[PDB]
Amino acid sequence: MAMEQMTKFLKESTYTFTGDDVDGDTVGVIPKNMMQVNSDPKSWEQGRDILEEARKGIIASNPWITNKQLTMYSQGDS
Amino acid sequence: MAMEQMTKFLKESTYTFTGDDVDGDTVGVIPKNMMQVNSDPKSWEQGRDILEEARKGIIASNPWITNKQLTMYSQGDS
Amino acid sequence: HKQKVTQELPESTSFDVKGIEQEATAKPFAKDFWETHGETLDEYNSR
């Protein structure tokens, strides 16, 4: 039961990011709590779009990277 | 013999709780000693009902949980 | 002769430094959605 319960908790509260072809199609994991833009938690969805427009926006400005591919990480409040 | 004897001791004196679909159909284990409501030990049965009415009663009031599912635990006298 | 020892005592002080208090444990995202949209997360994705 512990596995299913921690899995459900992470599934309801987190969100994996993904980009172009990357082995395992996962680039970072941020909680759906640190991505809101309003007081209601559904607003996380809106806060998601900006990031997918920001990450791409960085790739379109910093192409010299190893792959045209960044990472993602949320420590504390950032 | 040690295995059969500790198994018999735990079987006569404890009681597993269970709820809705949970992997392994076991949510906590409380001794049949900490659930009495009278001085005679059979009364544990009565003290069981309240808990099964309390746990559900909590689920019917706190539905936002990961699963509609709590745990159970008896440390000391509680 | 005057006693060259006064009842006046030495004084030490506590290292009392106050920084910035922490925010309380913000509600879980499941309960957040609950008391804001009246229905749990499972009942919102079934639509």
Side-chain angles (χ1 to χ4, degrees):
Chain A
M1 183 181 92
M3 173 73 47
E4 90 166 1
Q5 292 195 341
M6 64 92 79
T7 302
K8 189 85 178 325
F9 184 82
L10 296 201
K11 174 161 309 312
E12 292 309 340
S13 279
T14 69
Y15 168 81
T16 47
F17 276 65
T18 314
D20 53 88
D21 64 333
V22 289
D23 272 338
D25 53 48
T26 300
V27 169
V29 178
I30 316 177
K32 311 163 65 181
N33 219 311
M34 306 182 175
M35 293 171 69
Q36 327 178 332
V37 300
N38 318 334
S39 180
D40 53 342
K42 213 165 161 175
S43 88
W44 81 282
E45 203 154 39
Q46 274 50 43
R48 188 253 316 273
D49 290 358
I50 298 174
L51 283 166
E52 290 279 4
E53 306 314 295
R55 191 168 65 84
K56 293 177 186 308
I58 298 174
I59 301 294
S61 197
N62 303 84
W64 59 266
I65 318 177
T66 50
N67 299 299
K68 292 195 174 182
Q69 259 283 344
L70 296 166
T71 79
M72 197 163 289
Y73 189 53
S74 90
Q75 86 182 36
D77 180 351
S78 289
Chain B
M1 183 181 92
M3 173 73 47
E4 90 166 1
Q5 292 194 341
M6 64 92 79
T7 302
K8 189 85 178 325
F9 184 82
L10 296 201
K11 174 161 309 312
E12 292 309 340
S13 279
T14 69
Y15 168 81
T16 47
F17 276 65
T18 314
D20 53 88
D21 64 333
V22 289
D23 272 338
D25 53 49
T26 300
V27 169
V29 178
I30 316 177
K32 311 163 65 181
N33 219 311
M34 306 182 175
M35 293 171 69
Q36 327 178 332
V37 300
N38 318 334
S39 180
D40 53 342
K42 213 165 161 175
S43 88
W44 81 282
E45 203 154 39
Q46 274 50 43
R48 188 253 316 273
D49 290 358
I50 298 174
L51 283 166
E52 290 279 4
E53 306 314 295
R55 191 168 65 84
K56 293 177 186 308
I58 298 174
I59 301 294
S61 197
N62 303 84
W64 59 266
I65 318 177
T66 50
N67 299 299
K68 292 195 174 182
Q69 259 283 344
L70 296 166
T71 79
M72 197 163 289
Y73 189 53
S74 90
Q75 86 182 36
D77 180 351
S78 289
Chain C
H1 287 199
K2 260 183 211 152
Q3 213 170 316
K4 43 184 81 73
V5 157
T6 311
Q7 193 91 38
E8 168 207 20
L9 283 161
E11 281 312 326
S12 65
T13 43
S14 87
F15 195 108
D16 258 331
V17 55
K18 315 174 47 192
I20 311 90
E21 71 195 89
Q22 267 189 23
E23 310 90 327
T25 68
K27 308 201 178 322
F29 180 84
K31 176 184 196 171
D32 220 10
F33 208 105
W34 191 65
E35 67 203 51
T36 303
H37 286 205
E39 75 171 59
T40 62
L41 296 168
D42 303 349
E43 282 166 10
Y44 161 80
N45 302 135
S46 80
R47 281 76 168 275

